[PDB]
UniProtKB/Swiss-Prot annotation, chains A, B:
Cysteine desulfurase-like protein; part of the gene cluster that mediates the biosynthesis of the secondary metabolite ustiloxin B, an antimitotic tetrapeptide. First, ustA is processed by the subtilisin-like endoprotease Kex2 that is outside the ustiloxin B gene cluster, at the C-terminal side of Arg-Lys, after transfer to Golgi apparatus through the endoplasmic reticulum (ER). Cleavage by KEX2 generates 16 peptides YAIG-I to YAIG-XVI. Pyridoxal 5'-phosphate binds at residues 90-91, 176, 225-227. It holds the Pfam family Aminotran_5. Keywords: Pyridoxal phosphate, Transferase. Its EC number is 2.-.-.-. It comes from the Eukaryota. This is Cysteine desulfurase-like protein ustD. Disruption phenotype: Impairs the production of ustiloxin B but accumulates intermediates such as ustiloxin F and C. Belongs to the class-V pyridoxal-phosphate-dependent aminotransferase family. The modification N6-(pyridoxal phosphate)lysine is found at residue 228.
Amino acid sequence: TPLENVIDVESVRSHFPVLGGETAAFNNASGTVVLKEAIESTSNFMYSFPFPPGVDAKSMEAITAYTGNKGKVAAFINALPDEITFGQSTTALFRLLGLSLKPMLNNDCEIVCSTLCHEAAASAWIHLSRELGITIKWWSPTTTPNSPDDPVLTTDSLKPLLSPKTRLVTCNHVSNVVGTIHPIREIADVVHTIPGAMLIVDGVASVPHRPVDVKELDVDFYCFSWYKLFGPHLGTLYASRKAQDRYMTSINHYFVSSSSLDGKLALGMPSFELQLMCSPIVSYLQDTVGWDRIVRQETVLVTILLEYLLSKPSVYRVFGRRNSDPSQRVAIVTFEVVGRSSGDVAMRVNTRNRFRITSGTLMAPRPTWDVLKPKSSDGLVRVSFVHYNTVEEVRAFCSELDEIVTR
Amino acid sequence: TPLENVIDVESVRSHFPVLGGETAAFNNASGTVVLKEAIESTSNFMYSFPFPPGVDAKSMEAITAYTGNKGKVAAFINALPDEITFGQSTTALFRLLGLSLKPMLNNDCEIVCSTLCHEAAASAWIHLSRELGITIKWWSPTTTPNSPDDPVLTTDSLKPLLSPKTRLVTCNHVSNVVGTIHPIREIADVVHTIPGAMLIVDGVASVPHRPVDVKELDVDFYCFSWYKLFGPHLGTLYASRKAQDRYMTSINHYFVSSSSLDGKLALGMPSFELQLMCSPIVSYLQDTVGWDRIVRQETVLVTILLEYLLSKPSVYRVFGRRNSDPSQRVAIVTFEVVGRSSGDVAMRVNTRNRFRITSGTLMAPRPTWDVLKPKSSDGLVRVSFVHYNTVEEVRAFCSELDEIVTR
């Protein structure tokens, strides 16, 4: 039978009013449409009496709403509230984590970084390394000759780079230019065979597509960005109690208690108005739509796009996993058109403005140019779906892309 | 004649709907009510098609709106757009500026810090000093025996601490626990007698109360926080072209152009939704109400509060300038009640919940405990007005405060 939508298109898209227009949103890995309920929540807070709140009954209700919001976001990733903090961005929070870790590190310790890392991560650990006088032991992904454009992160590739002096291992849960799901719990179990070693995971390309449980991942640190999750431009970093007590030094004022992650890393007054946009998104994803429908909807969308791209192997070179299986890969699909500029293809699609896609290095030169290695000087073409995208849109996009390349 | 409001109370307070309730907002130095037009602006952006924007006509109009917003904010302080950047907070932006300056500094250079500095500043320059192996040459303010609780920042106190190896001088335009206006252009002219030396000014307690022109101040760096300015929890840092080209190193990804301040200091995707709240505030302050009415309204409010406090010298010890003159001091008034806890006084006022005030160290231990030195273990009482506060409110507050202390 022809593949159809799993979601109620109208019910889901009622929360995202701009999706009714001419242009379909196929660049969600660079930023999603904001959840209506999230905007309504921040409006209500910003129209309310300002922080810092008083001791009166109405002020205590506003404190309960703030603490409640943090409690739900913490439960979203199965963390305790004192194990999470809100920041400017993942790039910022990774840099501040570096400053927190630096005092208990030195030039004798080893940092292992995945070459599939976003520069948000790479820049943090390059800067930390340079300040400590460390040279990074870079961790290359594995390709097999039958799947040369499908880079995989394996424990077997990591083990040779590990030593008794390994202290930092850094990788992503998903690469924003590949879309493959890495085996984080397996990597964590291997990293933790080295006493003193900590695993830092960039989960920016994961948390929007899959339910996350940082305790089941047994990661030391996990970080994600709400603007790829129907939310504001705002980061959230997780740090285990063990990792906080053993590895972290406060970067905050001397008089601020350093027990919580907020205490250690929170620089100035936090953006309460942006934080309170987040609990509405948690309840929307978990309860209103649910992960079963989200994953199934996104899987069907990836099936239709891969079906068309893999149908013409002489035209399209698909990077990453060449199946739509949910446990294997999320709805981030990178490819290049053989003998054509990726920029030229993206411009032609975006100029027509029926679909919004992107091309280039996508703030990830190491995975793009050192691993995937597109023939195009302009780099990769990327289409990225979320659950509010429709089968009808993907089918129409495949027709338009075909027209552009067949000309 | 009895002092009356200069503003149209109803017209001004139409932009701040929560001001109609029971509680009067007298803790504006910790956070103001958000401008209605600012909330409406961010709503419209967040309901609009997400960034990063396309090449279509409607996307280019959204780019023009973003660039236009930055252009107006830059003109608000008489800076060029490439001389300003938005950040998480003043505390964060000062810390990132430290990282940018550090590579071209060493243990032979001297950092001079005012003891009137907020810990937002102190923490930045303490951390930078510790990383470079520098000990700060702390700059004490001047008191005279006839005005012992009125600390002043003088060029004459600064000169002995200056050497040919001075590279950083740091102070605030206004202290959040004093409210006195410091002579920044005079300090700048003196700092610039030392070639290579740069002046960094914390203007968080200034920009809400007075028009600012960073070119007339001739400061190297100026920083302020929008949440004390009827806006979001969001910082803006200015850096002169000279200061950028000569003193700053990019902390951003290797592939990002370092010509603009954004290029140098912007970590991850900026919070566009919070930035676009700012141009509405610029047009509200400059054109809708205007600085003449704002300064005159705030001056009358300070006159009524000081009048009452100075009327009972045996009860109230007033810190800072004991006049309401606009060129001398802004509407931030700190005092303590003789033989009474500052905390006890604040609790009694806030519990009644007719007025919102604050007590304590207010994230400024150095000015509070090392300069002002209140007799109370609980520190200072602070009342802070902005132009939307009324003479009727201040008169009523004076009566309530009297009742609490006369008991």
